[PDB]
Design an enzyme around this catalytic site. Structure first.
Site, PDB file in Angstrom:
ATOM      1  N   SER A  45       0.796  -1.233   0.000  1.00 57.37           N
ATOM      2  CA  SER A  45       0.000   0.000   0.000  1.00 57.37           C
ATOM      3  C   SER A  45       0.823   1.276   0.000  1.00 57.37           C
ATOM      4  CB  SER A  45      -0.937   0.038   1.203  1.00 57.37           C
ATOM      5  OG  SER A  45      -2.004  -0.870   1.034  1.00 57.37           O
ATOM      6  N   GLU A 143      -4.617  -7.360  -6.076  1.00 55.17           N
ATOM      7  CA  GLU A 143      -3.659  -8.255  -6.730  1.00 55.17           C
ATOM      8  C   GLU A 143      -2.205  -7.801  -6.555  1.00 55.17           C
ATOM      9  OE1 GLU A 143      -3.827 -11.199  -8.606  1.00 55.17           O
ATOM     10  OE2 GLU A 143      -5.898 -11.350  -7.859  1.00 55.17           O
ATOM     11  N   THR A 212       1.421  -3.021   3.709  1.00 49.95           N
ATOM     12  CA  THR A 212       1.395  -4.380   4.262  1.00 49.95           C
ATOM     13  C   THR A 212       0.781  -5.304   3.223  1.00 49.95           C
ATOM     14  OG1 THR A 212       1.043  -3.395   6.437  1.00 49.95           O
ATOM     15  CG2 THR A 212       0.745  -5.750   6.284  1.00 49.95           C
TER      16      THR A 212
HETATM   17  C1  LIG Z   1      -4.143  -7.655   1.391  1.00 53.11           C
HETATM   18  C2  LIG Z   1      -3.737  -6.735   2.536  1.00 53.11           C
HETATM   19  C3  LIG Z   1      -4.311  -7.161   3.876  1.00 53.11           C
HETATM   20  S1  LIG Z   1      -3.454  -6.258   5.215  1.00 53.11           S
HETATM   21  C4  LIG Z   1      -4.151  -5.315   2.137  1.00 53.11           C
HETATM   22  O1  LIG Z   1      -5.280  -4.967   1.936  1.00 53.11           O
HETATM   23  N1  LIG Z   1      -3.047  -4.398   1.981  1.00 53.11           N
HETATM   24  C5  LIG Z   1      -3.225  -3.025   1.581  1.00 53.11           C
HETATM   25  B1  LIG Z   1      -1.815  -2.633   0.961  1.00 53.11           B
HETATM   26  O2  LIG Z   1      -1.627  -2.766  -0.392  1.00 53.11           O
HETATM   27  O3  LIG Z   1      -0.727  -2.712   1.769  1.00 53.11           O
END
Ligand SMILES: C[C@H](CS)C(=O)NCB(O)O
Length: 264
Positions: A45, A143, A212
């Site tokens: 993220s 993804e 994350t």
């Molecule tokens: C799949 C994962 C669960 S914590 C998520 O939604 N990350 C957001 B990001 O791209 O870090």
């Protein structure tokens, strides 16, 4: 980039079990701290910070962009979209979507903004336009979190993250009002209290953006940090691990950040 006193990082990395990537710069002195600063790590993220900056850059050419309401549908709501979900019935402006992507890592908000910018390719083009030749976003939420070892999709390097962050928050890539808005959104982040913020003295101002992936021990944080009376420090801390089930560690991120700050 080098580091002739790398052994503290190397020991932290061995204890973690994965790979750690650090780059930090004191923008007053030009001093830097490096460890795997040139190696690719998944963005997760953390791309959402640069997404908001790209939106702000576009706002310099399209008046009214930030105030434009978007009435999105329920099937925009991918898992972990806490603000977008809360405001589904009202819709949200582009500014609110940007703030949510930055400050809550809101997934639906990020995808809606990516779409306005021409997708992952459009954000990658923005980053190329400020001189970042490392950054690449290839996929959408969720993804892009696959974090597969050796996959260059949706990756950058700690150094290129830090350099681009500096350009957008402190340099002239953004006009002054846009630049202040970006800094303000980062200072308001809610997701980063156990990462870089946990290594920064309580009296230093901080803005940051976390990531994350949820797999392969992969997590990260980057930040602008304002030491008392000094030019800011900009830094990036990224991690990954070789096995899909390896757990990420916020404590490792905070510890690597502390080593960088102490090194400076
Ligand atoms: C799949 C994962 C669960 S914590 C998520 O939604 N990350 C957001 B990001 O791209 O870090």
């Amino acid at each position: 980039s080098t580091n002739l006193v790398a052994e503290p990082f190397a020991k932290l990395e061995q204890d973690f079990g994965g790979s750690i990537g650090v780059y930090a710069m004191d923008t007053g002195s030009g001093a830097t701290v490096s460890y795997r600063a040139e190696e690719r790590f998944p963005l997760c993220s953390s791309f959402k910070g640069f997404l908001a900056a790209a939106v702000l850059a576009r706002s310099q050419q399209q008046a009214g962009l930030l105030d434009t309401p978007i009435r999105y549908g329920k099937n925009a709501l991918v898992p972990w979209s806490p603000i977008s979900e809360k405001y589904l019935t009202t819709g949200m402006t582009v500014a609110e979507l940007s703030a949510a992507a930055v400050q809550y890592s809101d997934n639906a908000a990020a995808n809606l903004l990516l779409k306005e910018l021409g997708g992952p390719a459009g954000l990658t083009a923005f980053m190329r336009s400020i001189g970042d030749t490392t950054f690449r976003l290839d996929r959408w939420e969720l993804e892009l979190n696959s974090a597969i070892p050796g996959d260059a999709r949706d990756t950058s390097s700690p150094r290129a993250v830090t350099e681009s962050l500096q350009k957008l928050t402190l340099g002239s890539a953004l006009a002054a009002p846009q630049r202040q808005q970006f800094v303000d959104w980062l200072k308001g982040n809610t997701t980063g209290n156990h990462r870089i913020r946990a290594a920064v003295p309580a009296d230093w101002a901080v803005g940051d953006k976390t990531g994350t992936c949820g797999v392969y021990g992969t997590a990260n944080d980057y930040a602008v940090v304002w030491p008392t009376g000094r030019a800011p420090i900009v830094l990036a801390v990224y991690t990954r691990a070789p096995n899909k089930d390896d757990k990420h560690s916020e404590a490792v991120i905070a510890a690597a950040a502390r080593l960088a700050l102490e090194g400076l």
